[PDB]
Amino acid sequence: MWFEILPGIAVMAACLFIPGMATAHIHKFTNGGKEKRVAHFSYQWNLMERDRCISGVNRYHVTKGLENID
Amino acid sequence: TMYIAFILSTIFVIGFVGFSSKPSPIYGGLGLIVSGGVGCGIVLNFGGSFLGLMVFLIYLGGMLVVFGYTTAMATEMYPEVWVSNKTVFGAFVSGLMMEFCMVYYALKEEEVEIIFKFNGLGDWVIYDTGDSGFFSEEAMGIAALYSYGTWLVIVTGWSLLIGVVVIMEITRGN
Amino acid sequence: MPLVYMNIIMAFAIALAGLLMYRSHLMSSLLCLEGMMLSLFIMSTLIILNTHFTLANMMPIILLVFAACEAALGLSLLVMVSNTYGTDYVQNLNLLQC
Amino acid sequence: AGRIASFLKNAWAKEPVLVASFAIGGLAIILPSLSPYTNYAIRINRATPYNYPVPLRDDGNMPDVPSHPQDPQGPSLEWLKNL
Amino acid sequence: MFMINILSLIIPILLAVAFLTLVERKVLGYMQLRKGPNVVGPYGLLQPIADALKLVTKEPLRPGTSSISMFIIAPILGLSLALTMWVPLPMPYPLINMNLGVLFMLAMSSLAVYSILWSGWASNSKYALIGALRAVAQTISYEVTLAIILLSVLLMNGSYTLSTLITTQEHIWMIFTSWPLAMMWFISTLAETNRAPFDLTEGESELVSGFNVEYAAGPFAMFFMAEYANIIMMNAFTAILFLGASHDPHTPELYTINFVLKTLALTITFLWIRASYPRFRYDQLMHLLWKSFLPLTLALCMWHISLPIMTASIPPQS
Amino acid sequence: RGEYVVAKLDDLVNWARRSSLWPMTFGLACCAVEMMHMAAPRYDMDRFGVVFRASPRQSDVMIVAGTLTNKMAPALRKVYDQMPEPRYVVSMGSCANGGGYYHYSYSVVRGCDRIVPVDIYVPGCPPTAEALLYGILQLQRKIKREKRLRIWYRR
Amino acid sequence: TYKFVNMREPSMDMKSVTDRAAQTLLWTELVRGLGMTLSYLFREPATINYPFEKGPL
Amino acid sequence: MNIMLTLLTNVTLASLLVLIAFWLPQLNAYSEKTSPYECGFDPMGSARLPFSMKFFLVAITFLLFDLEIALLLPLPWASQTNNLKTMLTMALFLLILLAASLAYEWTQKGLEWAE
Ligand SMILES: CCCCCCCCCCCCCCCCCC(=O)OC[C@H](COP(=O)([O-])OCC[N+](C)(C)C)OC(=O)CCCCCCCCCCCCCCCCC
Ligand code: SF4
């Protein structure tokens, strides 16, 4: 009886799950497999702008370690 | 994308011409809230995030909202329309053409002297180069209202309480 | 000065002209007053953010709240006038000529 | 005695919302002035380093300024670690 | 790719609204000893589709006394606001990451009151305007408690950033710290979406359908979609604000499952209120807001400003 | 040919229109209570997609449940006119059908079909809630066999 | 014989007044209504599958 | 700018839904069909029905309360000052003045929906 309401609830649940999962996976895809960098303040923005410049490929998320120079 | 603040400001002035030509007050209010939205966008492009969101929440969703609500009560039997008067069209057209002429002159000359001297070299040009650190300078300046602005809080709160008392005095109608 | 300032000051001038050149409705004039305040807010905000006058960041808040208090007062006056004459027409506000 | 107790009785019986609101507001007014932790909150706000701590030149006779971040001079946050 | 993100946010939300219609009908039916939609498709699963198809092929009677510009602008504004309310929501990671996300929601929802002020005015009929004015007054009056409750709750967050709510509620729900504000917030959200005993603008037995009398078929459907999107969005905001889910940065699907389940539970509670209570009178809900909710909200805002200071529990602003 | 596509589209639109038959509560007399009994849990008209609707602007079918008097007929025709199309009328009970017990009265219109076009005539005084439900399903089957797009394709 | 339907005066002591204050502030009878609807949600509906099932005559 | 694209998409899709919603159905309209709905009869226009000072007063009181709320919004950053006693004094001052405005409106009729 009451459990026949569950199909519509499951459809609603899938439709509501899609946005969050899609956002997370798009963020991973477009940021080098890592979380999309958060820049709430100008210091974080400057960190990302420095990251883009030193990557050589104009992408902040290409991280240069001690293998780049030292 | 190169010019964003200028389209926003031109639209701002266009909305000002629209509601200041004074059609029926509901369309004047619509023009005012369009102008307020584009102005909130203007100050968002300048780093004034809290100030622009204040414009939105309190001006467009408060003060306006109340204005349109009060117009919806004290209006005409047939609430007027923009088209109904040739005066509205004339005022709006004259304002639009004086906008267009002056923006064209400023864009192609960059040394207009209508009251003030102006140079449309850009709008990004005046921005300074620096880091604000780990905080929003605007938010720190506004949150100083409670530490630096004690006198300001005192007088503004008193004026708001007086405003409540005053509105209740005037509207009693006896 | 940059051309955004030009357009903001132009908006103030247009609101001033619209307020000074009346029509029948009182609400239209009050909306022109509100436009004048909004242009003042944006001009102040641009000047304050551009020069990084940090303590002056709160000035637009104060301007907004005080001008909205005045707008509430003007709305109450309009409502009283309308309850007198059924309309907010300024031509009914002429019985002080004598 | 009985007058204030009776007033509180009537208010609790007919306007519990106002009683709760006035009690909560009164405590919010009063309690901060008695808390030992208010000074701690002030100290935490003071110990948050938003700006760069631009140094000084030791003209001699500066025995209390550290020299190095890990010298036994200058304020310590050991108190904050256990709080 | 960001455009795909926008699309994969918007479209599933509209589908969730469509099937929320079915879920609400079934919950109401089973609380009323009946079934609800169980014929059109398996367990009524094709019923929202039947409703959407029938509506878009039904004649949209426009009033002869209607300013068509605003008559069509009001549904556009309503639906655009209802959709854009989801862009800062931190299903683990937001589409739009702002410092002032909840301020943005407050502003956007306060702009949504125009869709009633413009629909009632545009529809004319000289009577739907009065219902529109009542709805606008109710909406603006409950905006006060929404804003102040949000202000008091966020004094533990430290900012208006919604992602910080996840961090604030890592070890404990914010419900255990602000449950009175949670009840007042939930009822304010009930009142803002014109739901439950607060559905005065569309009283089925008070003014038939109020501001939505003249709207039919398509624009009525879009208004309905806007309202139900606002319902789900407000319940999502409530779940994120008060029932913060645990987040694993390497497994955000767990947070999404948690959040979706809690949002559905709160939405089912919204439908649960609809089936349990009579309707408030207009003056009665105005009295509730102005004389019951507002004093307690002011007192609790005072309390929540005092509390972090006197306990050295002020959150970071970063 | 291209008549197969038109037939499929007609089938789709007529399935959507009969799966969401939203009626208008025109309860004039005793027939009104058997119709809310068809509304009641035992028959549950909502399980067929037949909702409890509101102002004629969102109604698809008019149910004339009760005696129509001369004083009342102009209002019934007004709300019938205000229904958006497609719209249908079900006459429920003897009074609405042909006057009924009050057929020979000075103040009663003899059948609502003198005022509005009627699609289904549900007999009984009152028809049982099951009889009204049968009439509603019969109306649904009337909608299923409409050929509006096939009529248009051969015009 | 007759009976009064609404002729009970509420008790005015500490415990009763606190009971009514808690009922006012914590919405307990509203919770009872929610409980009644929740209990009805888990009951088998009285609907019959017309026309495959018919009302008894 | 991502947010601008998001707003453009939302507005565009809402307007497209209008266009399908308001042009796709088949129409056949006459005079008595689109007549204003008044439960089976015709409505009276009368003369400026939306009146009564109470509807305007609630709007004005909401406006003033909203202004004080605008004054309260900077509070989350205000608690980050070293001078916490002044900030607490001023925030509580603003809230007492809000409570005083509510109380003055309450006691002087104000919030009442009178006869
Ligand atoms: C050390 C601690 C210090 C801090 C202490 C803080 C205070 C603690 C005690 C206060 C408790 C009460 C808090 C406020 C409650 C509401 C206030 C109020 O006015 O109530 C009475 C008000 C008015 O009640 P009334 O009408 O009986 O009284 C009016 C005034 N008199 C008595 C004079 C007539 O009632 C309501 O608000 C009714 C709401 C209607 C809708 C009901 C919905 C039911 C379902 C709710 C489900 C749960 C909601 C949350 C879900 C989850 C969300 C995340
Ligand atoms: S047909 Fe019979 S039951 Fe129905 S309204 Fe007429 S008299 Fe009453």
Among residues B92, B99, B100, B76, which one has the least CA distance to residue B22? B92
Among residues E132, E126, E101, which one has the least CA distance to residue E114? E132
- The 3-state DSSP class for residue F24 equals strand
* List of chains touching F (3+ CB pairs within 8 A): E, G, H
d(CA B14, CA C35): 12
Our answer on whether the CB atom of F101 is closer than 6 Å to any ligand 2 atom is: yes
Q: If you ran DSSP here, which 8-state letter would residue E100 be given?
A: T
Q: If you ran DSSP here, which 8-state letter would residue G9 be given?
A: P
* Number of domains forming the structure of chain B: 1
d(CA E95, CA F52): 39
Q: If you ran DSSP here, which 8-state letter would residue F100 be given?
A: G
d(CA E271, CA E279): 14
Is residue C15 within 8 A of residue B32, CB to CB? The reply is no
**Is the peptide bond between D36 and the residue preceding it cis, with omega within 30 degrees of 0?**
no
Strand partners, F61: F23, F88
d(CA E31, CA E39): 19
**Residues whose CB falls within 8 Å of the CB of residue E275, separated by 6 or more in sequence, listed in order:** E27, E28, E31, E32, G37
Contacts of E316 in chain B (CB under 8 A): none
* Number of domains forming the structure of chain H: 1
- Number of Cβ within a 10 Å radius of residue F46: 24
Q: What are the contacts of A55-58 at 24+ separation with CB within 8 A?
A: none
SS3 sequence of chain B: CCCCHHHHHHHHHHHHHHHHCCCCHHHHHHHHHHHHHHHHHHHHHCCCHHHHHHHHHHHHHHHHHHHHHHHCCCCCCCCCCHHHCHHHHHHHHHHHHHHHHHHHHHHHHCCECCCCCECCCCCCCCCCCCCCCCCCHHHHHHHCCCCCCHHHHHHHHHHHHHHHHHHHHHCCCC
Q: Which CATH number covers residue H13? A: 1.20.58.1610
Neighbour-count burial of B147, counting CB atoms closer than 10 A to its CB (0-12 exposed, 13-18 middle, 19+ buried): middle
- Number of Cβ within a 10 Å radius of residue D37: 17
Chain breaks in chain E (C to N over 2.5 A) after: none
d(CA F107, CA F95): 12
**E294-310 and E175-192 helices, crossing angle to 10°:** 150
Which CATH code for domain C3-92? 1.10.287.3510
**C26-50 and B5-20 helices, crossing angle to 10°:** 160
Neighbour-count burial of B85, counting CB atoms closer than 10 A to its CB (0-12 exposed, 13-18 middle, 19+ buried): middle
**Which chain E residues in 260-279 lie under 8 Å from chain H, judged by CB atoms?**
none
**Exposure of C33 in the CB half-sphere (CA atoms within 13 A):** 20
Q: Do H35 and F78 touch (CB under 8 A)?
A: yes
Is residue E315 within 8 A of residue E163, CB to CB? The reply is no
Reading the block at residue G30, the tokens are: 């509203």
Residue type (1 letter), F29:
A
Reading the block at residue E111, the tokens are: 């702009």
**Which chain E residues in 79-98 lie under 8 Å from chain A, judged by CB atoms?**
86, 91-95, 97
Residue H114 lies in a domain: no
**Residues whose CB falls within 8 Å of the CB of residue B66, separated by 6 or more in sequence, listed in order:** C72, C75, E140, H59, H60, H62, H63
d(CA E9, CA E88): 11
User: In angstroms, what separates the C-alpha of G54 from chain F's closest C-alpha?
Assistant: 8
Give the dihedral of Cα atoms B90, B96, B102, B108; nearest 10 deg: -130
- Phi, psi angle pair for H61, to nearest 5°: -70, -35
User: In angstroms, what separates the C-alpha of G5 from chain F's closest C-alpha?
Assistant: 29
d(CA H28, CA A63): 66
Mutation site for E-interface testing, chosen from D21, D29, D34, D42 by largest number of E Cβ within 10 Å: D21
Q: If you ran DSSP here, which 8-state letter would residue E293 be given?
A: I
Residue H3 lies in a domain: yes
Q: Do H40 and F55 touch (CB under 8 A)?
A: no
The F88-92 sheet, strands edge to edge: F23-27, F61-65, F88-92, F120-122
Is residue E293 within 8 A of residue E145, CB to CB? The reply is yes
Q: Do A9 and E23 touch (CB under 8 A)?
A: yes
H helix runs in chain F, sequence order = 2-18, 31-39, 73-82, 94-98, 129-144, 148-153
N-to-C CA span, chain B: 58
* Per-position DSSP letters for D40-55, written without gaps between them: HHHHHHHH---S----
Which of F56, F79, F85 has its CB closest to that of H28? F85
Helix (H) or strand (E) holding E143: helix E128-153
Among residues E91, E244, E269, which one has the least CA distance to residue E175? E244
Reading the block at residue H59, the tokens are: 């709007």
Is residue B46 within 8 A of residue C44, CB to CB? The reply is no
d(CA G47, CA A2): 13
Contacts of B150 in chain H (CB under 8 A): 86, 90
d(CA F97, CA F29): 13
Residue type (1 letter), E157:
N
Neighbour-count burial of E17, counting CB atoms closer than 10 A to its CB (0-12 exposed, 13-18 middle, 19+ buried): buried
Residue H115 lies in a domain: no
Residue H113 lies in a domain: no
Is residue A42 within 8 A of residue C52, CB to CB? The reply is no
Strand partners, C38: none
Is residue F121 within 8 A of residue F127, CB to CB? The reply is no
* Per-position DSSP letters for H45-110, written without gaps between them: --S-----HHHHHHHHHHHHHHHHHHHHTTHHHHTTSS-HHHHHHHHHHHHHHHHHHHHHHHHTST
- Number of Cβ within a 10 Å radius of residue F136: 25
Reading the block at residue E145, the tokens are: 């408690």
Reading the block at residue E96, the tokens are: 């739009």
Our answer on whether the CB atom of E233 is closer than 6 Å to any ligand 1 atom is: no
Q: If you ran DSSP here, which 8-state letter would residue F46 be given?
A: G
d(CA C8, CA C60): 15
Is residue E250 within 8 A of residue E169, CB to CB? The reply is no
Reading the block at residue F132, the tokens are: 């009204």
d(CA E45, CA F52): 19
Q: SS3 breakdown of chain D: % helix, strand, coil, rounded to 5?
A: 60, 0, 40
Mutation site for H-interface testing, chosen from F57, F60, F62, F81 by largest number of H Cβ within 10 Å: F81
d(CA E71, CA E58): 18
**Residues whose CB falls within 8 Å of the CB of residue H39, separated by 6 or more in sequence, listed in order:** E208, F75, F79
Residue H17 lies in a domain: yes
Our answer on whether the CB atom of F16 is closer than 6 Å to any ligand 2 atom is: no
SS3 sequence of chain A: CHHHHHHHHHHHHHHHHHHHHHHHHHHHHCCCCCCCCCCCCHHHHHHHHHHHHHHCCCCCCCCCCCCCCC
Measure B48 CA to ligand 1 centroid, in angstroms: 38
Reading the block at residue F31, the tokens are: 């027939």
d(CA E157, CA E101): 13
Q: Which CATH number covers residue B9? A: 1.20.120.1200
Give the dihedral of Cα atoms B152, B155, B161, B167; nearest 10 deg: -110
- Number of Cβ within a 10 Å radius of residue B78: 11
Residue with tokens 């089938």: F11
Report whether F112 belongs to an annotated binding site.
Answer: no
By alpha-carbon position, which residue is closest to atom 31 of ligand 1? D15
Burial C35-67 (b: 16+ CB within 10 A, else e): bbbbbbbbbbbbebbbeeebebbbbbbbebbbb
d(CA H102, CA E279): 26
Give the dihedral of Cα atoms E260, E266, E267, E270; nearest 10 deg: 180
Is residue F108 within 8 A of residue F95, CB to CB? The reply is yes
- The 3-state DSSP class for residue F71 equals coil
Our answer on whether the CB atom of E186 is closer than 6 Å to any ligand 1 atom is: yes
- The 3-state DSSP class for residue E277 equals coil
Strand partners, E248: E251
Is residue D37 within 8 A of residue E308, CB to CB? The reply is no
Is residue F150 within 8 A of residue F6, CB to CB? The reply is yes
Reading the block at residue C29, the tokens are: 């004039």
d(CA E123, CA E214): 6
Resolution in Å, one decimal, please.
2.1
Among residues C11, D63, B70, which one has the least CA distance to residue E140? B70
Give the dihedral of Cα atoms C80, C86, C89, C93; nearest 10 deg: -60
Residue type (1 letter), C96:
L
Our answer on whether the CB atom of D17 is closer than 6 Å to any ligand 1 atom is: yes
- Phi, psi angle pair for D19, to nearest 5°: -60, -50
Is residue B73 within 8 A of residue B100, CB to CB? The reply is no
d(CA A25, CA D25): 47
d(CA E56, CA B11): 35
User: Measured between CB atoms, does E144 come within 8 Å of chain B?
Assistant: no
d(CA H90, CA H74): 12
* Per-position DSSP letters for H85-98, written without gaps between them: HHHHHHHHHHHHHH
Which of H84, H92, H99 has its CB closest to that of D42? H84
Ligand nearest to the CA of F26: 2
Is residue E118 within 8 A of residue E73, CB to CB? The reply is yes
d(CA F77, CA E144): 46
Contacts of B133 in chain A (CB under 8 A): 41-43
Mutation site for F-interface testing, chosen from G41, G50, G53, G54 by largest number of F Cβ within 10 Å: G50
